[PDB]
Amino acid sequence: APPTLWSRVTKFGSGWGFWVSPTVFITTTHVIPTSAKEFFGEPLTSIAIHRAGEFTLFRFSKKIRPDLTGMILEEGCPEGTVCSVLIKRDSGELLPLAVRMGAIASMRIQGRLVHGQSGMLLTGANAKGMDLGTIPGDCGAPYVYKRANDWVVCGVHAAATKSGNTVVCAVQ
Amino acid sequence: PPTLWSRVTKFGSGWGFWVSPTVFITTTHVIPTSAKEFFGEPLTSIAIHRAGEFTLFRFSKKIRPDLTGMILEEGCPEGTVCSVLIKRDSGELLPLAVRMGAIASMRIQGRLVHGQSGMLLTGANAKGMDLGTIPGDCGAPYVYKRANDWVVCGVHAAATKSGNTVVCAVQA
Numbered sequence: 613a614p615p616t617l618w619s620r621v622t623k624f625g626s627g628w629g630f631w632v633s634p635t636v637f638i639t640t641t642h643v644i645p646t647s648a649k650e651f652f653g654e655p656l657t658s659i660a661i662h663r664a665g666e667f668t669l670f671r672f673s674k675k676i677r678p679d680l681t682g683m684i685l686e687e688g689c690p691e692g693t694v695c696s697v698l699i700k701r702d703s704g705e706l707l708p709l710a711v712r713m714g715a716i717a718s719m720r721i722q723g724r725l726v727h728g729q730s731g732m733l734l735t736g737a738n739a740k741g742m743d744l745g746t747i748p749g750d751c752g753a754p755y756v757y758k759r760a761n762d763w764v765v766c767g768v769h770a771a772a773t774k775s776g777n778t779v780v781c782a783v784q
Numbered sequence: 785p786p787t788l789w790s791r792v793t794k795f796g797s798g799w800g801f802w803v804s805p806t807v808f809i810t811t812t813h814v815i816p817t818s819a820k821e822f823f824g825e826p827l828t829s830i831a832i833h834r835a836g837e838f839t840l841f842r843f844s845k846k847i848r849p850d851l852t853g854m855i856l857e858e859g860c861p862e863g864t865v866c867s868v869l870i871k872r873d874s875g876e877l878l879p880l881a882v883r884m885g886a887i888a889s890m891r892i893q894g895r896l897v898h899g900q901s902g903m904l905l906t907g908a909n910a911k912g913m914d915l916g917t918i919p920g921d922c923g924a925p926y927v928y929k930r931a932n933d934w935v936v937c938g939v940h941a942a943a944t945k946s947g948n949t950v951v952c953a954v955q956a
C-alpha cells in the first residue's frame with residue numbers, strides 16, 4: 613500500500629485513527645479516551661464530532677495535517693471487494709491484511725453487540741493470533757482498496773471473532 | 785516470545801527461514817555462487833543439503849539461540865491452506881493464503897520447476913494492491929497451524945506472470 617496511506621495511520625487512544633484530509637480524522641468509537649477534552653492541541657469547542665455506533669469522524673476548524681491531500685471516504689464497499697487493513701505492529705513493521713468484504717451485519721462478539729461491514733481474512737486457514745490475524749490493539753485501522761487509478765478508505769477496524777477468521781469494519 | 789516473522793531473513797537475491805537455532809531453509813536459486821561465509825560462519829563449518837529448488841543449511845554453532853525448533857515436513861496434504869510469509873524491503877509483512885495441490889513438474893513462464901503447486905486465494909488480480917507475489921519474494925516460507933503446532937513445509941520457488949499458480953519447493 614502506498615507510503616501516503618501509511619503516513620495517515622496515527623496511534624490514538626487504545627488503537628489507531630486515519631487522516632482522510634488535513635481537517636478530517638476517522639476512528640473506532642471505543643478506542644477514544646472517555647475523559648479527553650483536547651485533540652492535537654485543539655479544544656472540543658473547535659471540533660465537530662459525527663458519531664454513528666463504532667464509527668466516529670472528527671472535523672477540525674484548522675488544518676492539523678497540511679502535508680496531506682484529501683482522499684475519498686465511502687460508506688463501506690461492494691460485496692466481494694478485496695480490501696487491505698493497514699495494521700502497524702511492533703518494529704515499524706507494516707501489516708496490510710487482505711480481507712474479502714461481505715454484507716452489512718449485526719453480531720455478538722465476546723461481551724458486545726457490533727454493527728458494520730463483515731469480512732473474511734485471506735491471510736491463512738486459522739488466523740487466530742498476531743502473525744496472520746488481528747489483535748485488540750488494531751482497533752481503528754483503516755480498510756482501503758484501489759479502484760482504477762484511485763485508493764478509497766471505506767471503514768475502520770471494530771471487532772474480530774474468537775476464531776479470528778471474521779472481522780467487522782465500522783462504516784460512515 | 786519470538787513471532788514467526790522474526791524467522792524470515794533477507795538472504796542472497798531473496799529470503800530464507802530459521803527452523804531452529806542451527807537450521808535455515810531457502811530457495812536454491814537465491815543463494816550466492818561466490819561466498820566464504822554465511823551469517824559470519826565459514827562454509828567449512830556449514831552442512832549444505834540441496835534437493836532441486838530446496839536447500840537446507842545446518843550450522844555447527846547456534847546462530848539464532850532466541851528460537852525454539854519448529855516442525856519441518858516434506859510439503860503438506862492436498863487441500864491444506866498454507867500462508868506464504870512474504871517480507872518486502874518497504875518493511876511490509878504480506879501473509880497470503882494459498883490452497884495447496886499436488887507435487888508436480890510445472891511450466892512457469894517457459895521454465896520447468898518441481899515442487900508442490902498452490903493457487904493464491906486473494907482472487908481476480910494479485911498485482912496492483914498487496915495481493916500476490918513478485919520475483920524478489922523467492923525463499924519465503926510456506927506455513928500452517930495444525931492442532932497447537934506451526935508447521936513449515938517448504939519455500940517459495942516460482943509464480944506465474946498471470947498471478948494464480950505458485951510453486952513451493954519441498955525437502956527430499
Ligand SMILES: c1csc(-c2ccc(-c3cc[nH]n3)s2)c1
Nearest residue numbers: 733734735736737865881883905
Ligand atoms: C476448497 C475448495 S476451494 C477452497 C478455498 C478457497 C478459499 C479458501 C480460503 C481459506 C482461507 N483463505 N482462503 S479455502 C477450499
